[PDB]
Structure formats: C-alpha cells, structure tokens
Amino acid sequence: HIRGLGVDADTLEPRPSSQGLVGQEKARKAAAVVLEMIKQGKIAGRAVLIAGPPSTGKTAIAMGMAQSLGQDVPFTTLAASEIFSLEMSKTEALTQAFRKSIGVRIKEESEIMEGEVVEIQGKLTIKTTDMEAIYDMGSKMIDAMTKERVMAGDIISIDKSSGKITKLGRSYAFLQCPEGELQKRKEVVHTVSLHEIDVINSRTQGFLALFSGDTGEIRSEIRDQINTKVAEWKEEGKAEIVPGVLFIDEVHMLDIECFSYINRALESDLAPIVIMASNRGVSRIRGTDYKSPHGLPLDFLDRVVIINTHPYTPDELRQILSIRAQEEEVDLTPDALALLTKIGQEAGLRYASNLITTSQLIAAKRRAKQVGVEDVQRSFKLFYDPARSVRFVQESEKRLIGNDGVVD
Amino acid sequence: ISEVRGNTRDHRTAAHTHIKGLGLNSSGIAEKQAAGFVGQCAAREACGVVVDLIKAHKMAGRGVLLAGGPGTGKTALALAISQELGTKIPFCPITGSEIYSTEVKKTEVLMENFRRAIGLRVRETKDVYEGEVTEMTPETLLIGLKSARGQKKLRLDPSIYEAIQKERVQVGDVIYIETNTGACKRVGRSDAYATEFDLEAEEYVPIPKGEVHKKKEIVQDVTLHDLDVANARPIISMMGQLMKPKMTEITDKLRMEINKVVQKYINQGVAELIPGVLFIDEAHMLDIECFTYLNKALESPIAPIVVLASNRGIATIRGADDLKAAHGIPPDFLQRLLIIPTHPYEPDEIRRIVRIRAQTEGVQLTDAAVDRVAEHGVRISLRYCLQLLAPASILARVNGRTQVDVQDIAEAEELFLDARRSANILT
Ligand SMILES: Nc1ncnc2c1ncn2[C@@H]1O[C@H](COP(=O)(O)OP(=O)(O)OP(=O)(O)O)[C@@H](O)[C@H]1O
C-alpha cells in the first residue's frame, strides 16, 4: 500500500498526497532532512522521535523513512508493551527487535516465476507467450498475494526462495508477456534480516505455538553459528551488512533498563535507524522516580531528534477513509464519507475506520450496493468511541449531576 | 548390493585354469581326453554322478571324500564338480592347515569359507523415474519430472496414486518412483530452492543426473562373504589391504544386518541364493570340534556341497585321545559322505597332461623334453614336473630359443630341486 516517503528529490518539499502517503507535510519534510543528515554523516548514532496525536500515520512516516534509504532495507514495528512478555526476557525481546532490523545482502541463484495470471485452498493458473501451466495454491501463498491485491491478468514475478510476489504490471487495462519458460534461475540479491537467519537455522515452530510452549526465544548456541558465519562472509565479500530501521511505538512504556540497551545497541557502527513514537504530552519514566516530557530519561532527550505530526484536516481525513474504504472493498455515498470524516474530527481516525467495516454489514442486511448516512449513523449509535464509552460508564456508576443542576 | 564387488582367491585355482570342467557324454561315461582331463575315468564318472544327485536334491545331509595320493586329480575333480553344477557358482578350496589360525577360532575361519561357498544370483530390472514434481489433475495423476539434463511428463497408474497420497507430496520435490511395485518420496527436498543462509539444514536433495526415464540392469554374482567384506568398511584398495593382526572389522552383529537384507531380497523374489561347493584338502588335519560344526552344517538346507580330500590311509582323530580312523575322518562324519578313489597316473598318462599345461601356460617345447619331464612325474610328484615348465621357458628365451629342449629342462632340475631331493643332498 505505502509506496514511499512522497517528497521532492531536489527541493525536499513534500506533495499533499503522494507515494502512498497523505498529508503531514511538516513531519515528512523533517523526515527528509533526517535521512540527509545520516547520509552526510552529520548525525551519528542519533535516534528519531515522532511525537504527535494518536493515529497520525506515525508508522507510515517511518515506513517512508525505510523505502527512501535503500531498495530493500529492513523495517520492523515494535510496541513497547510487547517487550514485557510472560515468557521471553525483555533483553531477548529487544535483541530479536534489533536483529529483525539488521540485514545481509548476498547474490544468490534462485528460480523466479514470471508470467500473466488467470485466477480461480484454491488453484491459480499462470500463462506465458510460449507455455501454460496449472498450480495448486499453498495456504501461506494465498495470504501473501491477497495483501498484494493480485487480480487476474496481472504480470507477476514470484521468487520461490523468498516466497515474495512482486507486481511487475499488466498486459491489458502496459508490459508484454515474458518469452521463455516460467522458472528461470538468475543471480539475484537477497536481503534477509539477522533474526530471520536465526529463525530459519533454529528449530521450526510447530502448529499452534500460542496454544502452548515457549516463545521464539532463539538459543545462544544457534545465534553464535549465524554471527560467526556473517562475520566470515563480511571478510570474504560474500555478504554486505545493511542497517535498516527499527520503529518503537508506545515509548513512554519503556523501562530505564531498555534505554540503556537501546544506547548500547545504538553504539555500534552498523546500528539501525532507531525511530521512537510517543502519543503523549507529559508522561513519567518507568523504573526512575522522576518525570519527563515523552517518558524519555534526562540523557535521551538531548541525543534524540524530535519530529512532530499534526491533526489531520477534514479534507486530509476525506481521502484516508476513502483509501481504507477501497482496501476493505466497500462502496460509500458522498454524504456517508462526509459523515465518517465528521466522526474523525471529534473522535479518532481509528474509531472512524472501525465504523467502515461495521456499517458494511448493516448495509448488507438492508441489501444495498451503496453504504449511506443512516447506515453510518447506526454504527456510531451501536458502537461507542473510548471517550463516549467511559462517559456512559461514569454516569451509570454515580449520577455526578442531578436533575436540579446540583452537583453531589 | 550393486556397489558390492566379488573378490576371489585366483592363486588357488591358478594351477587348474587349464581345466574347463568334467569331460563326459550324455549317458554319463567319461571321455579319454576332454575338458582338460587325462585318464582318471573311475573317479571322473563317480563325481559325475554326485553332480546329478545335487541337481535331483538327493544329497540329504551328504558330502564327498576324495581318497588318493598327492597329485591324483583331487583338487582338480573338486573344481570340475563346481564347473558342472552351473554358471558362476562358488568354489572354495581350503586345506586343514588354514583352520589352524592365531587370532580367529578354528571355526571363525571355517565360517567365512562357508560364506565364501554360498552365492547370490541377482536378476533385477527396474524402471527409474527421478526428478522434481510438476502436478496436473486428470481423470489417474499426471506428474512432470525435471532432471539435470532432461524433462518428461507422465500419466501415472491409479496404483501409484494410492501410494503417493500415503507419503506427503508438493510441487518441487525430488522423487524416486518405480513401476515394479516401488514407492519412495523425499518431502520438500530440492537443491533449486535452497538459500545460502542455512547450512545445517540438509533438508534439500540435488537434481538427479542424466534423464528421468532410466532402465537399470542388475546382474550380480557374489558370495555371502563378499557382502560381509564390503559392508565392513566405514573398496578397490581392500583387494590388497589386510595389514592388521586382530581383523576386528567383521563382527557377529554386522552379519545379522546382511542376513536380514538377503532374506528381504528372497521374499521379494528379486534374487535367490545358490549354494556352491566347499573343498577341504588335508581333511585329517581338521579338529573333532570342526567335524561337529560340519555335522550341524550338512543338516542345513542352505549349506553348500562339502567335498573333502585325504592323502592319508589310517590317521589319528585330531581333538580325540588318539583314536585311529580311516582318512582321519571320525565315524560320525565318515558315514555322512561317499568316498571316490583317485588312481595315480602311469608315465604314458603324465606326458599327455604336460602337453595340455604347456599349451595353456604358453610354453613351446620339443617332444623329447616332454618325455624327460614325464620321467620326473613318475620318479617324483606330478606337481614338481609341472612346475619345471616356467623356469625352462626362461632358460630357452635366454638361449634365444622358443622351443624348450632336454638341455634346457636338465638345468631346471639342477637349479630347482624337489623337497625330497633337497633334504637328502644336505646329508
Ligand atoms: N587327470 C588330469 N588331467 C589333467 N590334469 C591333471 C589331472 N590330474 C591332475 N592334474 C593336474 O596336476 C596338477 C597338480 O596336481 P594337484 O595339485 O591338482 O593335485 P590333486 O590330486 O588335484 O589334489 P592334491 O593337492 O590333493 O593332491 C594340476 O594342474 C592338476 O590339474
């Protein structure tokens, strides 16, 4: 869905809606400066901080930071809460996160399936200008291209070694059909993260891992075999270490012991771009008795580079909800989207996005091809936003204000 | 079993390469000169009857004994018994002195010789289908295999369809399937979809060489000992490798692994095991404990033909408190076999043999030299005179001649003297 950063190459002035990104020009222009600061070597071992109101495309801006660095640089999302797990030490939880960010570039010989598609757990048939063949769909392969939104007639390249499907284009509404036989083994660059090499070489996770058993805690013995092989590949010239970008969300939740590890991992010359994201104005530090602005220690605030996102305008919100409406395959009347964006004004964007999927089912029961205002007004009255739900409980708990207008 | 190659002691049978078998007509009567034999009609015909008794399966716990002096066609007739039994049959010639080992027991050495006398005739014809998998669903299954130098699609029988569903399959798996009731699968194995990141994986298999469709022809003729000596290694050098006193490579547990796989090949009907002939020279040298092993061996149906030979008339039983018996064989085992007597050759018969051996060895000689060497075949043993052919040919080549004369053979007796004459000369 997200194409890139959506900024000008020379002037670095961002477009209102470009490269899968909508609005937030101030933050995206500041994001473009940070990328240039690292490239010139001006900023060395410095974290980024995307502060702002909730649901202001904070993940998307950092997703833009990734694609604008290199062709295949690793980007990983980590919520600060996910670190505090019942089984897996918060050290291993953070080590996995950093290893998910650092990748290695190796040129490998692997077969790539290239050709036009003729669509139907299932069976999807492929075609070339010379040969035709039927292929039974794998359970994980179905979930892989549905996220890519692959339709019949599309020209695609499926690398069998990685499993990634890449949309090269289309023959009819354009790129023409490939000549030879589908599977062709070529010298292609493979970028696999350190954590992925660990999970490949370590014991395969059995079906229903959350049902019972230990988490993805990679053994120190296995990780050693990978680290020593990567170090041997660096010297040989076989592998090229590429530092990606780690995105940390809910940063206020991080303990003082986490920040000491983050700086220890940031100390390395091949450290990734650590992007922090705080949705809070004023928050206390965890582990430390003292309070701070975004929940960062007195030492981190001076090192970090802060960027601020702003609240979306009704016109900025207009397309965001329509893009999400098309992605969820729903058809709305112009009045309904205007109402849905009006919800996004006082209540959150995320709450308004939830009302999209709920209104579709009520419209399905009415048997209509257009989701209208009365269909949206229902979802708002059936399902409450956090601020309204708490208001509902508070009044039911104790009647704070009487009929007379007297308090208590 | 295909890699297993037969190693045979050719030095023992080297003195009998001139013999092709047993010379006899349809009725059973022996010819005057046939299959490289001269005289010995009575003994030739006698064992020419025992070969039929084996073929008719009437040798129920029975053996053969060759009674006669040194160089009376004993070892020669034993080889003829094998040659007449069938094609590529095991013949194991031993001497009682060989049993007398330093490390292994008297029967741990007699055991391997029995294993050297029981062979296996293999006649397996398999239709190989090696390569990857490219599944198609017809009305009972179409699979396209990809090999290192070829590509072929085939419409499989419904019998294979039931066998493939039992052992999980997916597109891009290296498989080994057979038309002759064979099913073998390698799930997810393919070197084509292998990343350089994982090394300790070993879950992938390389693309099979050559073509998908291969006609494998297996015609193997090896003894039971060949299976043991080939499975002992953890193999070309092994034909000259034996420098170890203990010889602990062959263990009872290793033989059990051979016995079970051999049984599996019989049950399938692929290869049947064929018992041959075990020849024991110096039969009197055998211990009483060895004869009781033989008594137990002869009772088994899998057992080969135990042919013994004794140059002694009355001899004390080895392993018993000085008990004189006929040929040194105990009564218990003497009754168990039938005796065939081997007659000594007269001077006229000896020179007929010389001409046969010289023709095979490639030694040209004058008529007068054959007479002089035959005189040594009657005064001394038949083996000694036959040994004079090789040095006399060198003495002739040195003199520039190809034809060996009396003067050349006269020096051979002067240079290479027999064990009897060499002893008396020292005084
Ligand atoms: N009847 C025969 N015709 C042709 N060759 C013979 C005949 N009899 C014996 N010989 C040959 O005499 C040579 C030496 O004798 P050999 O060692 O075979 O004695 P044997 O009687 O067979 O056994 P043993 O060693 O027990 O005496 C061999 O080459 C053998 O083939």
Descriptive report:
This is part of a larger assembly, with chains A (408 residues) and B (427 residues). Chain A has 408 residues and is α/β, with parallel strands linked by helices. Chain A folds into three domains: 1-100 and 213-312, Rossmann fold (3-Layer(aba) Sandwich), CATH 3.40.50.300; 101-212, no CATH class; 313-408, Orthogonal Bundle (Helicase, Ruva Protein, domain 3). Chain A contains 13 helices and 16 strands. Chain A has helices at 25-39, 58-67, 90-99, 139-146, 194-201, 220-236, 256-266, 300-303, 314-327, 334-346, 349-365, 373-382, 386-397; strands at 17-18, 21-22, 48-51, 75-79, 102-118, 125-127, 132-133, 154-159, 165-170, 183-193, 240-243, 245-249, 273-278, 283-284, 291-292, 305-308. In chain A, the strands form four sheets. In chain A, strands 5, 6, 7, 8, 9, 10 and 11 form a seven-stranded antiparallel beta sheet that branches. A five-stranded parallel beta sheet of chain A has the order 4-12-13-3-16. A two-stranded antiparallel ribbon of chain A has the order 1-2. In chain A, α7 (256-266) links the parallel β12 (245-249) and β13 (273-278). In chain A, α10 packs parallel to α12 (373-382) and α11 packs across α12 (373-382). The N and C termini of chain A lie far apart (53 Å). In chain B, the strands form seven sheets. In chain B, strands 4-15-16-3-19 form a five-stranded parallel beta sheet. In chain B, β7 (135-136) and β8 (141-146) form a beta hairpin. Chain B has helices at 10-13, 41-55, 74-85, 96-99, 108-115, 158-166, 224-231, 252-268, 288-298, 331-334, 347-361, 367-379, 382-387, 389-398, 406-415, 419-426, and strands at 33-34, 37-38, 63-67, 91-95, 118-122, 124-131, 135-136, 141-146, 151-156, 175-178, 182-185, 213-218, 221-223, 271-275, 277-281, 305-310, 314-316, 324-326, 337-341, 364-365, 403-404. Among the domains of chain B are: 123-218, OB fold (Dihydrolipoamide Acetyltransferase, E2P) (Beta Barrel); 347-426, Helicase, Ruva Protein, domain 3, CATH 1.10.8. The relative contact order of chain B is 0.15. Chain B has 427 residues and is α/β, with parallel strands linked by helices. At the A-B interface, β5, β10 and α5 of A face β7 of B. The structure holds adenosine-5'-triphosphate (ATP). Chain B: It is found in: Nucleus. Chain B: This is RuvB-like helicase. Chain B: Its EC number is 3.6.4.12. Chain B: Keywords: Activator, ATP-binding, Chromatin regulator, DNA damage, DNA repair, Helicase, Hydrolase, Nucleotide-binding, Nucleus, Transcription, Transcription regulation. Chain B: Residues 60-331 form the AAA+ ATPase domain.
